Short mmCIF file of C-alpha atoms in Angstrom, two decimals:
data_model
loop_
_atom_site.label_atom_id
_atom_site.label_comp_id
_atom_site.label_asym_id
_atom_site.label_seq_id
_atom_site.Cartn_x
_atom_site.Cartn_y
_atom_site.Cartn_z
CA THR A 255 0.00 0.00 0.00
CA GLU A 256 1.09 3.56 -0.74
CA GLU A 257 -0.19 7.11 -1.29
CA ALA A 258 0.17 8.84 -4.65
CA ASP A 259 -0.03 12.40 -5.98
CA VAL A 260 -2.93 11.15 -8.09
CA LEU A 261 -4.59 13.75 -10.31
CA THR A 262 -6.36 14.09 -13.67
CA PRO A 263 -5.34 16.59 -16.41
CA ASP A 264 -7.09 15.52 -19.62
CA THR A 265 -10.06 13.99 -17.80
CA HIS A 266 -13.07 14.98 -15.69
CA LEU A 267 -15.90 13.19 -13.90
CA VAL A 268 -18.70 12.34 -16.32
CA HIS A 269 -20.68 10.53 -13.64
CA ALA A 270 -20.20 11.47 -9.98
CA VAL A 271 -22.36 9.17 -7.86
CA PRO A 272 -22.02 10.72 -4.41
CA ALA A 273 -21.25 14.32 -3.42
CA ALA A 274 -19.10 13.81 -0.32
CA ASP A 275 -18.96 10.34 1.25
CA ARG A 276 -17.40 9.77 -2.18
CA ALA A 277 -14.51 7.56 -1.06
CA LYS A 278 -17.05 4.90 -0.10
CA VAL A 279 -17.98 1.73 -2.02
CA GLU A 280 -20.76 3.55 -3.89
CA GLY A 281 -18.17 6.04 -5.10
CA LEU A 282 -16.04 3.76 -7.28
CA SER A 283 -19.10 3.80 -9.55
CA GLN A 284 -17.86 7.15 -10.84
CA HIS A 285 -16.86 7.35 -14.50
CA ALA A 286 -14.46 9.58 -16.40
CA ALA A 287 -14.28 11.20 -19.83
CA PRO A 288 -11.58 13.04 -21.82
CA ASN A 289 -11.71 16.84 -21.89
CA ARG A 290 -12.72 18.51 -25.15
CA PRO A 291 -9.76 19.14 -27.50
CA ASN A 292 -8.81 22.82 -27.62
CA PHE A 293 -6.12 24.01 -30.03
CA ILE A 294 -4.50 27.41 -29.43
CA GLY A 295 -2.16 29.40 -31.65
CA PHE A 296 -1.58 32.45 -33.82
CA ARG A 297 -4.40 33.25 -36.24
CA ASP A 298 -4.08 32.80 -40.00
CA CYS A 299 -1.48 35.14 -41.51
CA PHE A 300 -1.06 36.51 -37.99
CA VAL A 301 -4.20 38.60 -38.46
CA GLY A 302 -4.74 40.91 -35.51
CA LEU A 303 -1.16 40.74 -34.25
CA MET A 304 -0.63 44.10 -35.93
CA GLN B 356 6.89 4.09 -63.96
CA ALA B 357 5.64 4.36 -60.39
CA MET B 358 7.88 6.72 -58.42
CA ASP B 359 8.59 5.72 -54.82
CA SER B 360 6.88 7.63 -52.02
CA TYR B 361 5.87 7.31 -48.37
CA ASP B 362 2.75 7.87 -46.29
CA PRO B 363 2.91 11.47 -44.97
CA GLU B 364 1.37 10.37 -41.66
CA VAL B 365 4.18 7.84 -41.23
CA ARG B 366 7.11 10.14 -41.96
CA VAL B 367 5.76 12.84 -39.65
CA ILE B 368 3.57 11.60 -36.80
CA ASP B 369 0.61 13.93 -36.27
CA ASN B 370 -0.66 12.61 -32.94
CA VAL B 371 -3.89 14.59 -32.66
CA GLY B 372 -5.20 12.17 -30.07
CA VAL B 373 -8.19 9.83 -30.28
CA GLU B 374 -11.93 10.48 -30.43
CA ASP B 375 -13.17 7.99 -27.83
CA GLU B 376 -15.66 10.10 -25.87
CA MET B 377 -18.16 7.24 -26.12
CA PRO B 378 -17.46 3.85 -24.51
CA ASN B 379 -17.74 0.76 -26.71
CA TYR B 380 -19.29 -2.47 -25.45
CA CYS B 381 -19.71 -6.05 -26.63
CA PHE B 382 -22.82 -7.91 -25.47
CA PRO B 383 -23.50 -11.68 -25.31
CA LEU B 384 -25.16 -13.29 -28.33
CA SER B 385 -28.14 -13.64 -26.00
CA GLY B 386 -28.58 -10.06 -24.85
CA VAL B 387 -28.56 -11.34 -21.28
CA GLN B 388 -26.73 -14.23 -19.60
CA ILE B 389 -28.89 -17.18 -18.55
CA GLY B 390 -28.17 -18.78 -15.19
CA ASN B 391 -31.24 -18.61 -12.94
CA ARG B 392 -34.97 -19.23 -13.30
CA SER B 393 -37.81 -17.09 -11.93
CA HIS B 394 -41.38 -18.07 -10.94
CA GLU B 395 -44.46 -15.88 -11.41
CA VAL B 396 -46.24 -16.34 -8.08
CA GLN B 397 -49.45 -14.91 -6.60
CA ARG B 398 -49.67 -13.12 -3.26
CA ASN B 399 -52.36 -13.14 -0.59
CA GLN B 400 -53.76 -16.14 1.32
CA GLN B 401 -50.15 -16.90 2.17
CA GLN B 402 -46.58 -15.68 1.65
CA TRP B 403 -46.93 -16.16 -2.13
CA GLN B 404 -48.20 -19.35 -3.82
CA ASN B 405 -46.50 -20.97 -6.77
CA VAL B 406 -47.96 -20.64 -10.26
CA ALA B 407 -47.64 -24.25 -11.38
CA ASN B 408 -48.14 -23.08 -14.98
CA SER B 409 -44.79 -24.33 -16.29
CA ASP B 410 -41.57 -23.37 -14.54
CA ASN B 411 -37.92 -22.49 -15.13
CA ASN B 412 -37.68 -19.11 -16.86
CA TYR B 413 -34.72 -16.77 -17.37
CA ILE B 414 -34.54 -13.22 -16.00
CA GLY B 415 -31.44 -11.14 -15.30
CA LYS B 416 -31.81 -8.77 -12.35
CA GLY B 417 -29.84 -5.77 -13.58
CA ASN B 418 -28.18 -4.69 -16.83
CA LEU B 419 -26.54 -6.84 -19.51
CA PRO B 420 -23.04 -8.16 -18.69
CA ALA B 421 -20.71 -6.39 -21.12
CA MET B 422 -17.00 -5.99 -21.79
CA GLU B 423 -15.53 -2.60 -22.67
CA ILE B 424 -12.88 -1.74 -25.27
CA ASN B 425 -11.58 1.62 -26.47
CA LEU B 426 -12.10 0.93 -30.18
CA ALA B 427 -10.65 4.13 -31.65
CA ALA B 428 -7.68 3.76 -29.29
CA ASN B 429 -6.64 0.33 -30.56
CA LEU B 430 -6.70 1.31 -34.24
CA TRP B 431 -4.41 4.25 -33.44
CA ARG B 432 -1.97 2.06 -31.52
CA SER B 433 -2.01 -0.71 -34.13
CA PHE B 434 -1.29 1.94 -36.76
CA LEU B 435 1.81 3.24 -34.98
CA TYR B 436 3.39 -0.09 -34.01
CA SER B 437 2.90 -1.43 -37.55
CA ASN B 438 4.10 1.67 -39.39
CA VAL B 439 6.85 3.03 -37.15
CA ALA B 440 7.63 0.63 -34.30
CA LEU B 441 8.68 -2.32 -36.46
CA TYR B 442 10.79 0.05 -38.57
CA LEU B 443 12.84 1.50 -35.71
CA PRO B 444 16.64 1.00 -35.89
CA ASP B 445 17.77 -2.52 -34.97
CA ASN B 446 19.63 -0.98 -32.02
CA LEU B 447 16.31 -0.32 -30.27
CA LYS B 448 15.18 -3.92 -30.66
CA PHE B 449 16.09 -7.13 -28.84
CA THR B 450 16.17 -10.75 -29.97
CA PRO B 451 13.05 -12.66 -28.83
CA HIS B 452 13.24 -15.30 -26.11
CA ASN B 453 14.31 -18.87 -26.91
CA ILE B 454 14.65 -18.41 -30.67
CA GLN B 455 17.43 -19.53 -33.03
CA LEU B 456 18.46 -16.58 -35.20
CA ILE C 103 9.20 38.80 -33.55
CA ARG C 104 10.49 36.75 -30.62
CA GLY C 105 8.93 36.10 -27.23
CA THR C 106 7.28 33.79 -24.72
CA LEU C 107 3.75 32.40 -24.99
CA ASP C 108 1.44 30.81 -22.42
CA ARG C 109 -1.47 28.93 -23.98
CA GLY C 110 -2.86 28.74 -20.45
CA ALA C 111 -4.30 25.64 -18.80
CA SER C 112 -7.16 25.49 -21.31
CA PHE C 113 -4.73 24.21 -23.93
CA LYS C 114 -5.33 20.57 -24.91
CA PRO C 115 -3.90 19.84 -28.40
CA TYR C 116 -5.60 16.45 -28.76
CA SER C 117 -8.64 14.25 -28.17
CA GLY C 118 -8.96 11.42 -25.67
CA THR C 119 -6.29 10.93 -23.03
CA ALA C 120 -2.63 10.03 -22.64
CA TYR C 121 -3.08 8.02 -19.45
CA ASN C 122 -4.47 4.47 -19.52
CA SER C 123 -6.46 5.15 -22.69
CA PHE C 124 -7.33 1.45 -22.89
CA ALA C 125 -8.56 1.36 -19.31
CA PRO C 126 -12.37 1.12 -19.06
CA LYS C 127 -13.86 4.57 -18.40
CA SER C 128 -15.41 2.95 -15.34
CA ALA C 129 -12.71 0.62 -14.03
CA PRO C 130 -11.03 2.20 -10.96
CA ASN C 131 -7.43 1.79 -9.81
CA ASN C 132 -6.38 0.03 -6.60
CA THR C 133 -8.78 1.78 -4.23
CA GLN C 134 -9.17 0.84 -0.58
CA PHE C 135 -12.67 2.10 0.18
CA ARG C 136 -14.67 1.68 3.39
CA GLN C 137 -17.56 -0.70 3.92
CA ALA C 138 -20.61 1.58 4.31
CA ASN C 139 -19.13 2.72 7.67
CA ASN C 140 -20.18 1.05 10.96
CA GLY C 141 -17.21 -0.72 12.55
CA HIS C 142 -15.55 -1.96 9.36
CA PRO C 143 -12.27 -0.06 8.84
CA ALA C 144 -10.74 -0.08 5.37
CA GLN C 145 -11.41 -2.58 2.59
CA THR C 146 -9.23 -3.58 -0.37
CA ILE C 147 -10.27 -4.08 -3.99
CA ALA C 148 -7.42 -4.88 -6.37
CA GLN C 149 -5.46 -7.76 -7.88
CA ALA C 150 -2.17 -9.56 -7.28
CA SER C 151 -0.67 -10.14 -10.72
CA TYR C 152 3.09 -10.67 -10.45
CA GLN D 356 -25.01 16.80 -63.09
CA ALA D 357 -23.26 14.14 -61.02
CA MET D 358 -21.58 11.61 -63.31
CA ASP D 359 -21.71 8.00 -62.15
CA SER D 360 -18.56 6.39 -60.78
CA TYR D 361 -17.35 3.55 -58.57
CA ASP D 362 -14.95 3.11 -55.67
CA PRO D 363 -11.55 2.13 -57.18
CA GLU D 364 -10.90 -0.25 -54.27
CA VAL D 365 -14.15 -2.07 -55.06
CA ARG D 366 -13.61 -2.52 -58.79
CA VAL D 367 -10.05 -3.76 -58.31
CA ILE D 368 -9.37 -5.42 -54.96
CA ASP D 369 -5.97 -4.45 -53.57
CA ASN D 370 -5.68 -7.01 -50.78
CA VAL D 371 -2.54 -5.64 -49.12
CA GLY D 372 -3.36 -7.60 -45.98
CA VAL D 373 -4.16 -6.32 -42.50
CA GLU D 374 -2.05 -4.51 -39.90
CA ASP D 375 -2.94 -6.51 -36.79
CA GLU D 376 0.49 -7.08 -35.23
CA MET D 377 -1.02 -5.94 -31.94
CA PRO D 378 -3.78 -7.95 -30.23
CA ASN D 379 -6.95 -6.12 -29.18
CA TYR D 380 -8.67 -6.84 -25.88
CA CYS D 381 -11.95 -5.92 -24.19
CA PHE D 382 -11.89 -5.77 -20.38
CA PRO D 383 -14.79 -5.94 -17.88
CA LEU D 384 -16.36 -2.66 -16.75
CA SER D 385 -14.71 -3.46 -13.42
CA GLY D 386 -11.11 -4.03 -14.46
CA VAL D 387 -11.20 -7.35 -12.61
CA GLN D 388 -13.97 -9.91 -12.06
CA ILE D 389 -15.32 -10.13 -8.52
CA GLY D 390 -16.07 -13.58 -7.13
CA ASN D 391 -13.94 -14.29 -4.06
CA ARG D 392 -13.01 -12.38 -0.90
CA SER D 393 -9.59 -12.16 0.75
CA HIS D 394 -8.65 -11.60 4.42
CA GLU D 395 -5.62 -9.67 5.68
CA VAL D 396 -4.31 -11.92 8.46
CA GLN D 397 -1.30 -11.72 10.79
CA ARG D 398 1.28 -14.48 11.17
CA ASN D 399 3.17 -15.70 14.22
CA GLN D 400 1.72 -17.05 17.49
CA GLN D 401 -0.22 -19.45 15.28
CA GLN D 402 -0.82 -20.43 11.65
CA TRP D 403 -2.16 -16.92 10.91
CA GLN D 404 -4.85 -15.12 12.95
CA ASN D 405 -7.83 -13.38 11.43
CA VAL D 406 -7.95 -9.59 11.21
CA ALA D 407 -11.52 -9.04 12.39
CA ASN D 408 -11.28 -5.49 10.99
CA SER D 409 -14.16 -5.87 8.53
CA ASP D 410 -14.17 -8.71 6.02
CA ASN D 411 -15.11 -9.72 2.49
CA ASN D 412 -12.82 -7.98 0.01
CA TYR D 413 -12.18 -8.65 -3.69
CA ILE D 414 -8.82 -9.63 -5.19
CA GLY D 415 -8.13 -11.44 -8.45
CA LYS D 416 -5.09 -13.71 -8.29
CA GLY D 417 -3.66 -13.19 -11.77
CA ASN D 418 -4.40 -10.95 -14.75
CA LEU D 419 -7.71 -9.47 -15.90
CA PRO D 420 -10.09 -11.80 -17.78
CA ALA D 421 -10.19 -10.46 -21.33
CA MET D 422 -11.61 -11.43 -24.72
CA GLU D 423 -9.57 -11.00 -27.89
CA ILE D 424 -10.70 -9.74 -31.30
CA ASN D 425 -8.68 -8.95 -34.43
CA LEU D 426 -10.16 -5.49 -34.97
CA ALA D 427 -8.40 -4.50 -38.20
CA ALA D 428 -9.29 -7.95 -39.53
CA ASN D 429 -13.05 -7.55 -39.08
CA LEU D 430 -13.23 -4.15 -40.80
CA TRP D 431 -11.42 -5.62 -43.81
CA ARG D 432 -13.82 -8.57 -44.02
CA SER D 433 -16.92 -6.44 -43.45
CA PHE D 434 -15.68 -4.19 -46.25
CA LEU D 435 -15.30 -7.02 -48.76
CA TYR D 436 -18.57 -8.85 -48.02
CA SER D 437 -20.58 -5.60 -48.16
CA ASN D 438 -18.94 -4.22 -51.30
CA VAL D 439 -18.24 -7.29 -53.43
CA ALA D 440 -19.84 -10.37 -51.85
CA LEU D 441 -23.44 -9.16 -51.95
CA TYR D 442 -22.91 -8.00 -55.54
CA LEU D 443 -21.67 -11.32 -56.91
CA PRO D 444 -23.73 -12.87 -59.75
CA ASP D 445 -26.98 -14.48 -58.62
CA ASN D 446 -25.60 -17.82 -59.83
CA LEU D 447 -23.12 -17.85 -56.94
CA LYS D 448 -25.89 -17.33 -54.38
CA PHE D 449 -28.50 -19.62 -52.87
CA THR D 450 -31.97 -18.93 -51.49
CA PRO D 451 -31.99 -18.77 -47.66
CA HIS D 452 -33.55 -21.53 -45.56
CA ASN D 453 -37.31 -21.59 -44.91
CA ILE D 454 -38.15 -18.32 -46.66
CA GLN D 455 -40.93 -17.49 -49.12
CA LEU D 456 -39.47 -15.74 -52.16
#
């Protein structure tokens, strides 16, 4: 047994069974889903940069 | 005359991720596993009297037993390993176990 | 032009995930929940595959 | 105005094979089938004394029970049958069983 710095970057809770009292048996029922893809960068022909 | 060329996606990997927002499941050829039999029984007069009208049915208390598999994911992985993994320099590979070479 | 850019935390250049993408979106890791409270401390759900 | 045409891959089959070097698996929605309970017990003083601290856990001794399926293979077959098998001359077909036609 051990403790980990567990986290979730590209995922969120799609189905959260219990609010609080979560760490209980009925909690593992929670499901996850990938976060929507979001691309970011300089516009076409750098429009607006000038 | 058929000039040589390569698949653009192979030369330069464009890992844009995988669209697997929806989970994929495989269900039994039955649509519900058979293992126990019910018994339509009437109440009142007792605790609930048998029906007698034929017995041994099949009802699954709950949802259908299914196995999950990230479809889109596999295809992506199979693509890579077959188009870039097997072509990596011999230095990154290792002879299999118990095999005359 | 030369400089530094910070796409922020809302930057996700891809779909799906990059962490156990083959893992069922319901299957949990080695969690040690609690049995509906009472006088039942801890409870392990896992697998010994070595 | 939308001239008729056909899918080049249908007219002339280019069976280049299938990239299925990697096996595909579907795992239970649990990540391990539940059927037996363990029991964290202490040694010494005896053969191993119970824990008492709550009981009935779930641990699978071994790997996860999975079902295999050659993904890439299926798609290839489904493609063929649906684009060239159902279009084969009637002479190569046969009326189904017990069906008015």
